[PDB]
């Protein structure tokens, strides 16, 4: 049966985490590491195990770790964590939690970066801008086997909430037209895409940042996406994200696959001649889900 | 993974065939829906191997524009002759796959936009208006449907799920959370009497998918009835935890509705912190952002 | 300008003194509030010339911590012996200015957290539960109060306003919008029969502020009653615009409640776009721009 | 009463607006102008006039400009606007609207910038791909009236920067405040102050807001950078103390300004671990705020 419980929106902010250094750079991005003067993460934790059943069927709380205590667990482990990535932090929390509570058979963690951008001061080492734009993500699932060994069964890293608009050099023509079609063909649209991008490594260890040369930074994925979007006379969103995926896998052969969840929020044209003027479209949004592997 | 589609397709229909002839339960006065106003928010996703080249080559020759999917959904609400969201989804899914023979799989999510009745004084009395309705942001019915086209051009449903989403319930007393693990990570006090606040999403699956459509309404399980089972069971129960509560809600649901196979709960704990203990009244406030949650299925095996 | 304070101070009280003894109107079955559960979201703003140096010198000696204001509000809900949000604000405002003599002005907004009854089966029958309530995200009552301390240490109310916020009403037929200006900027078709959708905020003021408190409940205007007037008038009326509609709602309010001085409307149009005209019909959500109207109905408009 | 109506969430995007150039720089900010390859604004329009009364009282739509038409007016006017600022775009719309509809006595415009940031492409800044930002954005406010002699006058103008979220990890205190029966807040000599800032300013001379003489225009980007520089430089004693100092620096850098208004909120984290860097967490819902005007 499905049987899990836990805690969501566990925010944790750490100052002066160990800097991320020695990353492999790529052409699309100036990214070369993270100072980690300020490091914030939003964590959601889910745990299960068959011995949790009576907490549901009988109201027996004997084996119930309070979700409040899980919040505490996560917050204190951020204080003790000696690594450099959100992926590595999740692995630290998972391993530690399962070693602590032996009746838990499965733990699933999601981590979302709270991004902070640098600011100018007469670049500050003290003042940061809390950003509401794109942010790194990490996902980890770990199990306790019947021989009491622990194994990672899933790991995925990501970039969420990237909103890109290309003002020209985009088309969407040639699609099916029939009784339900009113969309006109457009040989030059200002394509607006909302991108979530997730990748899996060939070797799960590479995500931890232990050998930083192998670590794929979300910042680098961001810049690949904007470069490829720029370079490409897009034929659809589908066309674009395939090519973004291919470029990612070329740049990072230590990656096994890249997953995209994209949305289309392209503006409606109001004045064609006239520069041009556009407006926000109605609520319905197009979306695409696609994996490139490898 | 290869899918594409359209979200936030809103469609509002006036004078849909009413839902009546349902079977009642003790926990609920629900007797049907007059459907003067019927509103749904639909998400559609489609797949098929023949869509590959739309990604790999930028060839749109087999692409149904998602804008067309929108039009398809909205136009089908106009010709829908059925009485439920679940049935509406089945109607759209079947029509869509019949229309687009190169599409192999479709997935539909429908969320009710709920409307509540209002009062008017007309012709000398105060009574429920047949014209003016209040749009509600509280709990709402949901439906989910996945259908495939087989090689012989027949269509099959491969998953169906109905639901009640967004139910926010607070019980002011008669709840405890004691006896949980207290170790070096614990700062939560034991509480023999708390005002438990739960956010509930309840999802059910039928033993026979046909019962979901409302064609034989006596087998249809209405989200409004599930709502009322949830509020009745909460009231009846000296709860020992949210875990304990949702098990008892699922048991009552499956006892009342033998046509159902299982019930799934996604619940969140948003219980208030106490500020003033004495003082029969008390004062509480909103807690901080972290929220507890539970994910649990009650099945046939849990029934005696 | 110089004010500071605290927002989103939530406070939930059980078994507040019930509101009863209100006067009824034909449009509403409202008979009072049992107040098993009473919830409010409060915002407090304070001002005073003596706060200046907290800004200009970083001197905090006359600063009431905004955290302490939160405690103040939450604690006073515990001691409040009244029956309305309006009276709760007056109690908080009066106590606060009495406590902090260097504060010259205080502004308070209270927003009801509304809860609805649910059914339970117990002791053999199905009936309204006295324990389980549904938190509502729909329309909610509001209150506003400004008070000052005068030189002789007396207190005066300088503005009071009550309201109903977030009422979303759709009337499926019996609405028109025709005869408006049609020029080089006009692409809206005339429509003799539209399903008008209005988002309503309605705010009223009393001729005597004391009537707002609930102390003499027969003079109190409940937001629930205003709600039912709005739905009733919307129903009764072959509307010619939202402008037309809200004028007639205001007229009915002022006619039913002669203790009210004026009623203010902030309305928004969210009327759906028609997709199918002949089948019942089908509509969908419009694009993001929304029309709005801001209008006060007053005594002179009566009757 | 009060009698207005209008349209909100009128979004309008323009490509290749005339670029803003020739701006006076300041120490705190690298800002030198705007390419305007992509310009977006969210407009709200409100209009009034005594002759609109019967549209309310009688259901007479004869003098009603449909709010839908107002939307069209704004979008069309962005197509023909030859200027370089949101402030200037609001004056263009206001003047043109009043000149068109003589029975309208007052118009109020709010413009909010939809900010777009530059992106990388291969190895330089893209002239085609921009990132839509949910962070801080420029604002403008304009009120214009027709007088009884049929002259038009601007009665209020205000520029702004909204939505700026700054956190300073150390070098902030909050001590010495009133302690009584209602105080539980401990004194803190070193907190990680998190402020949410809205900053609004008014010019001595309204025409300076339009950008016609760029050297006199005050850009929201410049205000942003002053705010972060001052926050950096200052061992703050309160949010009140900080925003006064930010205000003072703005008025010294920009003597063409008459005033600066602040609406700030305090969202500082709770400390969980003091001794390990430190660890903090998100506070509960209540938020402190401050409202203050600094004048010249
Ligand atoms: C505009 N548009 C649709 O309507 N559908 C689609 C699609 O599937 N892919 C696109 O890139 N654009 C688009
Ligand atoms: C308060 N609280 C927690 O912290 N965890 C849990 C839990 O798992 N179940 C509860 O009912 N309450 C609760
Ligand atoms: C549809 N519509 C507009 O565009 N403007 C207006 C208005 O001012 N009042 C309305 O009732 N409707 C409407
Ligand atoms: C923490 N804190 C309060 O509680 N009030 C105030 C205030 O007015 N100003 C601050 O800078 N901080 C603060």
User: Sign of torsion, CA A225 A228 A233 A237?
Assistant: negative
Distance from CA of C163 to the nearest CA of D (A): 17
B93: its two tokens: 């899914």
Residue pair A182/B66 in contact by the 8 Å Cβ criterion: no
**Which residues of chain D are within 8 Å of residue B287 when distances are taken between CB atoms?**
284
In Å, how far are A266, B90, C93, C241 from B72, measured between CA atoms? 21, 13, 57, 32
CA separation for the pair D257, D277 (Å, rounded): 41
Taking a C-beta distance cutoff of 8 angstroms, is the pair B97, B223 a contact?
no
Three-state DSSP class for residue B280: coil
Domain boundaries in chain B? Answer: 1-304
Distance B143 CA to ligand 3 centre (A): 35
C-alpha distance from residue A3 to each of A100, B196, C107, C124, D273 (Å): 20, 21, 49, 33, 33
Structure tokens at A281: 């479209």
- Beta carbons of A53 and A105 less than 8 angstroms apart: no
Per the annotation, the verdict on C6 as an active-site residue is yes
Topology of domain A1-294, per CATH? Urate Oxidase (3.10.270)
Residue B268, helix vs strand vs coil: strand
Q: What residues of D are in contact with residue C243 (Cβ under 8 Å)?
A: 5, 55-56, 59, 64
Ligand 4 pocket (Cβ < 6 Å) reads: C 4, 63, 65-67; D 174, 185, 238-240, 266, 288
Q: Where are the beta strands (DSSP E) in B81-154?
A: 105-112, 115-122, 125-135, 140-149
Among C284, C287, C290, which would you mutate to test the A interface (most chain A Cβ atoms within 10 Å of its Cβ)?
C287
Residues with Cβ within 8 Å of A275's Cβ and at least 6 positions away in sequence, in order, are: D14, D15, D16, D17, D79
In order of A165, B304, C23, D61, the CA distances from A132 in angstroms are 17, 51, 50, 44
Give just the sign of the alpha carbon dihedral D174, D180, D181, D182.
negative
Rounded Cα–Cα distance for residues A107 and D136 (Å): 38
- Cβ <8 Å between D236 and C301: no
Q: Which two tokens stand for residue D276?
A: 């390990």
Distance from CA of D19 to the nearest CA of C (A): 28
Count how many Cα atoms sit within 13 Å of the Cα of residue C153 in the half-sphere of its side chain.
5
| Ligand 1 and A190: CB distance under 6 A | no
Chains that touch D (3 or more CB pairs under 8 A): A, B, C
| Subunits adjacent to chain A (3 or more Cβ pairs under 8 Å) | B, C, D
Q: Which CATH class for the B1-304 domain? A: alpha beta
Are D283 and B288 a contacting pair at CB < 8 A?
yes
Give φ, ψ of A258 to 5 degrees. -130, 130
- Which has the closest alpha carbon to D220: D266, D263, D160? D160
Between CA D112 and CA D40 the distance in angstroms is 9
Tell me the CATH class for C1-303.
Answer: alpha beta
CA distances from B301 to B207, B294, B304, C111 (A): 14, 20, 8, 47
C191 φ, ψ (degrees, to nearest 5)? -140, 115
The answer to whether the CB of D64 falls within 8 A of the CB of C180 is yes
Contact across the interface for D132 and A192, Cβ inside 8 Å:
yes
Resolution, rounded to a tenth of an Å?
2.0
Contact C92, C27 (CB under 8 A): no
Closest CA to B84 of B247, B238, B216: B216
Nearest Cα of chain D lies from the Cα of C155 at a distance, in angstroms, of 22
How far away, in angstroms, is D13 Cα from ligand 4 center? Answer: 40
Experimental method: X-ray
B6 is catalytic: yes
Residue A18 among the catalytic residues: yes
CA–CA gap between residue C277 and residue A117 (Å, rounded): 52
The DSSP output letter for A146 is T
Cα B66 to ligand 1 centroid, rounded to whole Å: 6
Ligand nearest to the CA of D64: 3
Is B194 annotated for ligand binding? yes
Q: Are the C-beta atoms of D230 and D249 separated by less than 8 Å?
A: yes
Distance, CA of D27 to CA of D30 (rounded, Å):
8
Of the candidates C26, C133, C279, the beta carbon closest to that of B121 is on: C26
C292 in Cβ contact with D5 (< 8 Å) = yes
**D129, D192, D231 ranked by CB distance to A229: nearest:** D129
* Domain at D1-296, CATH from 3.30.70.260, 3.40.190.80, 3.30.1330.10, 3.10.270.10: 3.10.270.10
- DSSP-derived letter for residue A275 is -
What does each C-alpha distance from C80 to B173, C91, C107 come to in angstroms? 21, 7, 19
Given B53, B66, B215, B237, the catalytic residue: B66
């Amino acid at each position: 049966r499905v049987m899990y419980y836990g805690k969501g929106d566990v925010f944790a902010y750490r100052t002066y985490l160990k800097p991320l250094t020695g990353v492999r750079t790529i052409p699309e991005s100036p990214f070369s590491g993270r100072d980690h003067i300020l490091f914030g993460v939003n964590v959601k934790i889910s745990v299960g195990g068959t011995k949790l059943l009576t907490s549901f069927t009988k109201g027996d709380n004997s084996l119930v770790v309070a979700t409040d205590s899980m919040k505490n667990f996560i917050q204190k482990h951020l204080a003790s964590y000696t690594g450099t990535t959100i992926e590595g932090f999740l692995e630290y929390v998972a391993t530690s939690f399962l070693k602590k509570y032996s009746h838990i058979e499965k733990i699933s963690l999601i981590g979302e970066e709270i991004p902070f951008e640098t600011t100018f001061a007469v670049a500050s080492e003290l003042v940061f801008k809390k950003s509401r734009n794109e942010y790194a993500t990490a996902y980890l699932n770990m199990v306790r086997n019947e021989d009491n060994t622990l194994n990672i069964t899933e790991q995925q890293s990501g970039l969420a909430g990237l909103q890109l608009i290309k003002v020209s050099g985009n088309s969407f023509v040639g699609f099916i037209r029939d009784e339900y079609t009113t969309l006109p063909e457009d040989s030059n649209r200002p394509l607006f895409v909302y991108l979530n991008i997730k990748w899996k490594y060939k070797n799960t260890e590479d995500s931890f940042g232990t050998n930083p040369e192998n670590y794929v930074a979300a910042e680098q994925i961001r810049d690949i996406a904007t470069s490829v979007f720029h370079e490409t006379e897009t034929l659809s969103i589908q066309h674009l994200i395939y090519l973004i995926g291919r470029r990612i896998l070329e740049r990072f052969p230590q990656l096994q696959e890249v997953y995209f969840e994209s949305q289309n929020h392209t503006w409606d044209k109001i004045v064609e001649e006239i520069g041009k003027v556009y407006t926000e479209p109605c609520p319905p949004y197009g979306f695409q889900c696609f994996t490139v592997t490898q």
